[PDB]
Every structure is written in structure tokens, then in C-alpha cells.
Amino acid sequence: GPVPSRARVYTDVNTHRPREYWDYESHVVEWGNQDDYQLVRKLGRGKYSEVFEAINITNNEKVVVKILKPVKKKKIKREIKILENLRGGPNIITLADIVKDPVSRTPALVFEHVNNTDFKQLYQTLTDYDIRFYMYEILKALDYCHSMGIMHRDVKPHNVMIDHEHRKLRLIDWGLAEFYHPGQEYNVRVASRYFKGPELLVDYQMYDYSLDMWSLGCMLASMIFRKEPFFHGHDNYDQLVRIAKVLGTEDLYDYIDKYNIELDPRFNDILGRHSRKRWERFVHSENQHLVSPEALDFLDKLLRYDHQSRLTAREAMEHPYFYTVVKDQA
């Protein structure tokens, strides 16, 4: 069998809370009035929902409405419970209301509106400083949610709303998030391919908050190297091959051995033998202004196969890459 694992931080936070904090199947939903909201226009479509801009006609406020497609009752309550537990936390989107849509007869979550700067434009005109600033802001959201016993499990650029004009960032889409419990085996079929931690790719189910720290490293690498996505896999197997061509195969096999992981035999014919590369090989004239010794040191400490050896959010926030941002924010 695989060797068990516990988070190194915030291990027992949910155990020390009353059961109703994390026992979301027992949550009863508070329904608002659906007639308070008039849809203005469609913003997005997905496997699990459609998202609209709306107006609250009661106070004339602009709002965002997520109308769910069919999803298990318990996962609806999971997303709602997590959003309520995290309300008022730094850089976490606020759930403002929940209503029963009369057309789909399904739940609609009502969120604060963020005036999102176009991802493409923003990602092309970010300064080194801007990246440090916004990474710092994401880390606050992750440290808060992790300290509150919650893993996001879907960190990636499109789940980070940034209003660049107001220097305002919100981490959104808590529909994959879960409560961390020591010893629990979780579904590995989470996160988008390019952001999946190695634990997910080798089917190690006893994972924790550190999953989010891998995803964050993937975002950071793409921003500083201007390479989107950084690990560009063709499928879930080839994703680990792409990681292995950068992090090397030696540390991968040490990871497999240490946790006694049974590797899908498909992998043996494709992983090969690969040295760990130096980061300088992704540095080019066009991205040089975004790369610093500090950034590379920071990145290196996020992107580890061994989930126990990655920086925590709080450690990350203490790294020299953020020394100028921390000083200015005081």
C-alpha cells in the first residue's frame, strides 16, 4: 500500500472546529428572493454552470450570477459552505446571495462583481513589480483558506480576477474546493491539466493544501518566462513527462519510492531518463526583465515533486522576492 501523509501545517484545524463547520451535507441553505435579480448578459459557460452579469433591482448593484447545471446536492452545499466560511477573508470572492432560478429549478449563486482586466492584455503588460504584487495578493487568499481548513484545488489564471485599475484581486470558483482532513483520500481528477500537481498525476490520493502551491508555481513560471502554459502536456500522462524534463527523473523516482506509489505501467515506457534542468534555459531577451535570482529561488521552492517539501503560503510570503512589496504595503 502507499505510505500515508499529513499536511505539515494547519493539520487539525477542521478537527478543532465544531462539526457544522465542515460537515456540509447537514448545511441547510438560506434562499434569497430571486425577483431581486434581473439578468443583463451572459459572461461564460462551463460543464457545471452558466455565468451572467445581473443587476440587483433592490439597490441597483451590479452582481455576477452562477446558475448551476445538474450537480449533486452535497457538492452544491460544499461550495456554499466553503464560500460562507471564507467570507470577509483577504482576496476571496464574496458570495452575496443564493436563489432558486425558476427556469432551471436549480440554484444560482450571487457573487460580488469584479471589473476584470482582459487576461491577454494584462498578461502582456505586467511589470516584474506587478507580478510580485499580485502573487503576494494570491498568497494571502491561499494562506487564509488553508488556515481555515480549505484547499482550492483549481488555482489557475482564469480563477484569479484582477481589476488592475483598482489593484484589486479576487480568487474565484470554489466549486472544486474541499475541506482538509488528515488521512482522507481525495479524488485526483481535479484542476486543469497544466496546473495538476504530480500527486494527482501519479494517483496519490492523500494530498493536502500543498497541491495549491504547485499550481501557484505553474502560474508564476508562466508569468516570469512568458510561456503559457509552462508545462504543456498533451494528456495526463504526458503532463508528468513535461514536468520530468524540467525537474528531472531522479527526484521523481525518489518521490515514488518514498511514498511507495504504484506507478501506472504506461508511464515506464514514456518517462525515460531526464536530468534536472537549470532555470536559466527558459530565460530569453524578451522575458529577462521579469526574471531575478529572487524569482528563480522562489519558483524552485514551489515546484517540488514531494508535496511535503514545497513552501507553505506563509513561508512563500516571507521569501525575499516579496521584500519590496511587503515594505510598500506598510
Ligand SMILES: CCN(CCN)c1ccc(Nc2cc(NC3CC3)n3ncc(C#N)c3n2)cc1-n1cnnc1
Ligand atoms: C461558468 C464558467 N466559469 C469558469 C471559471 N473557471 C466562469 C466563467 C466566467 C466567469 N466570469 C466572471 C466575470 C466577472 N467579472 C467581469 C467580466 C465582468 N466576475 N466578477 C466576479 C466573478 C465571480 N465569481 C466573475 N466571474 C466566472 C466563472 N465562474 C466563477 N465561478 N465559477 C465559475
